[PDB]
Design a protein around this ligand. Sequence first.
Ligand SMILES: N[C@@H](CCC(=O)N[C@@H](CS)C(=O)NCC(=O)O)C(=O)O
Lengths: 203, 202
Amino acid sequence: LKLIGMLDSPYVRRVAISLKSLGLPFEHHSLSVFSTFEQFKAINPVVKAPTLVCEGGEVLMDSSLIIDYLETLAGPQRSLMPTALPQRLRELRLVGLALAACEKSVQIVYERNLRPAEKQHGPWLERVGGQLQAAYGELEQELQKQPLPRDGSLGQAGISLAVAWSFSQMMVADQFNPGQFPAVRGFAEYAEQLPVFLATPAT
Amino acid sequence: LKLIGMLDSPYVRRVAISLKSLGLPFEHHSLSVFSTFEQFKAINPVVKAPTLVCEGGEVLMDSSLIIDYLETLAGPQRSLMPTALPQRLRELRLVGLALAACEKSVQIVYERNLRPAEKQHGPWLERVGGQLQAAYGELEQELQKQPLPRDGSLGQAGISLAVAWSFSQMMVADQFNPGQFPAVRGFAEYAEQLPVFLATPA
Ligand SMILES: N[C@@H](CCC(=O)N[C@@H](CS)C(=O)NCC(=O)O)C(=O)O
């Protein structure tokens, strides 16, 4: 198995940590969809990261679909997802919120770095920034109501939430202030000291 | 169950058709993340469509996660996904390509409508347009290799691919030449005449 993409992308990182958490060995090819376009295009012409090349050479994209494939390959015993409806529903909500925070953080990065200042649109940044704040706000309320376990093991919500938070702090820190979203920050900083996160640095 | 969003969004439409295909009843609330921002924000502060409000009131977002939840409620017998690894791998590859097509199509729409002319960036549109072509090119090769069944039934790949194609032709047709991707076009046009697609207009 081969994971194509840079770990500074939260989508690539959540897959990398999911792979390790599921016990599936793999090769990591650190390629950028922007600075090594041709090299990435040679593997996946759609040029989307993460891209997973399976044992037979099949190419997959989209972090959630890649993880669905990995979950299938690993078997139910290793699932990072609860199966009971209530519990799974909650997990899906947390992952959804975390992925929304990822999407909005990335949209801000793209708006500011992929086009000249003159073409940057204030109303767009305002909207996206508000959505980013809402996402972490919802996550904060969920965690304040029901804290995540800190037992050395991780579920998809924990992985995705930690990866998302650390990414936002690295790339769009100007959207945050010290002490903000204490529950989310607290869990992310706890997760970042777990062996699997330490072995998969974003940078 | 309540589905919040407009069917012109391929992400919302894929969920709507998945719901019907899984046999799960639901209420459809046709709300726009743009023209009815506040109303949508009151239901989901993040303002992302589709949003699914569960029986208990829980709010879920992201079409793939929503469908995962729905697959769970519906049970294995109703699954729109193959379980055997080789077949599930292919299905996931097809869905991934379809969603990539949706993403790039939406990005072109956003670039051309959420900012005035002088804010539009040509290099970005050219990049995204190229990725859109690549997504359907890959899908076309997959279909030529193994055609999709036309027995009135649908899998997630079929639903997502058809919704993606129809969306692209409706919103960014200027990116396509008529003879391109005949197998993809062919399947989408077949699917659109199926009862579930006719009962769920975009
Ligand atoms: N739904 C995808 C989103 C991945 C994504 O937007 N990746 C970025 C890197 S952070 C990218 O490939 N940008 C290249 C492009 O869209 O041109 C996932 O969860 O993998």
